[model samples]
Target: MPVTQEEIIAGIAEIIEEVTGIEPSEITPEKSFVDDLDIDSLSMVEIAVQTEDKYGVKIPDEDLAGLRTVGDVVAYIQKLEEENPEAAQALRAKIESENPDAVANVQARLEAESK
Candidate 1:
């Protein structure tokens, strides 16, 4: 029951909507967290906080410097789960799904990283 990239995107969209007051439908992968979402640094912090709350992944401050877009956020969470096995295990239990292909790419990459 691991979370997929698509699922993470959808979840972040919801969190972005809550924090930015922007319509979730407008939250696309290409949208910049700052320019498109009209989110400042403080809002970015709040968004990161909300993201951690939603997924139980702790994102560090330096990492936030590299996340520039909506897709970046999704990728970071996938990267987060990939790096932290304990968090990944917990996330797998929290997410309920049977679609292997959904997370196949992520899991494959993690396998390579572990080697």
Candidate 2:
């Protein structure tokens, strides 16, 4: 499914957690990837790489640098999906839901996998 903003945010949280050794549930938008997450430029590169690998999008530095928060990054990624439909269609497999439904599906998958 063409992921939703909430799903993207949640996935970003997971990305942040895996790369930074922080808990996904604990991180928030105001938390700087550097100051808060203890991530440096190299970490950011890793994040972008992980984002591309996980979400299947080429996130430019200029685009990512503009994102100040986790929410911002999620929104940007979604917009990127809109702008680059070919890449999205080719890469991001549909999870098969829409709004609250899609959100639930993602959460369910996440929860199931957490076990």
Candidate 3:
């Protein structure tokens, strides 16, 4: 029950838009949070902290340095979900009931990761 790449991006984009006032559509995969969204370090920290609050997956400070772009954050979240199977499984259960599409996307991610 891990997060898919698609699910992670959708969730992160929602967060970015809420905090940075950037439109969800503009938070593209290649967008540099700082360069495109004007998101400073503190804002990024807020995003990271809020993400953990929302998802129960921890994102470490050292790891934040490597997340330069929106896509980076999405992939990092996916990695976090994958790393914490119990939390991810719990999330998947919730998602399956609330969002079947998310589950399908996670299925696709699982297939991709298996290769």
Candidate 4:
């Protein structure tokens, strides 16, 4: 299942919050991770690691430099999700097994997107 942009943003925001003390609401699409959010390189690496773990996608070291803003990261993940549906499905299955409530929320969002 392809995730919505909102879903990716929320997920990245959650990761950012976990890595840094920044509030999720502060993480908007246009906000730069370095300039706006004050996220240093080390914190960015941690965020990338967590995002890769959560999304089952590989974020290469070279590619990390290109993701300057929140929107860039979201777009990168969206491209990976589209390119690798098997990994995305595996991630969803893992999420469903671990968190039924999350699966319900995801289903609701998907239904809303469909309509």
**How much does candidate 2 score in TM-score?**
0.57
* Model 4 C-alpha lDDT per residue in residues 2-111, reported as the tens digit of each score: 55555656777788898886778776665666877776877878877988888765567777887766555655676664654332312334532422122333334333
Clashes of each: 0, 3, 0, 0
Q: Estimate, for each residue in 1-115, the C-alpha lDDT of model 1 and write its tens digit.
A: 5556455557667777777766666766656667767678777678679877776665667777866665556556766657443322223333333111234334443333443
What is the clash tally of candidate 4? 0
- Using all chains and alpha carbons, the TM-scores for the candidates as numbered come to 0.61, 0.57, 0.59, 0.63
Clashing residue pairs for model 2: 1-93, 1-94, 1-95
lDDT of 1: 0.60
User: Listing every candidate in turn, what is its Cα RMSD in Å to the true structure after a full C-alpha superposition?
Assistant: 12.4, 11.5, 12.1, 13.2
The 10-residue segment with the lowest total lDDT in model 3: 98-107
Off by over 4 Å in 1: 83-115
Rank the models by lDDT, top first.
4, 1, 3, 2
Q: Candidate 2 regions off by >4 Å?
A: 83-115
For residues 3-71, what per-residue lDDT tens digits would candidate 2 score against the true structure?
A: 664455567678767777667777665455566676776776676688778868656788778655554
Steric clash pairs (candidate 4): none
Q: lDDT of each prediction vs. the true structure?
A: 0.60, 0.59, 0.60, 0.64
Let me know the TM-score candidate 3 reaches against the reference structure: 0.59
What is the clash count of model 2? 3
Q: Decide which is better by TM-score, 2 or 4.
A: 4
Best by TM-score: 4
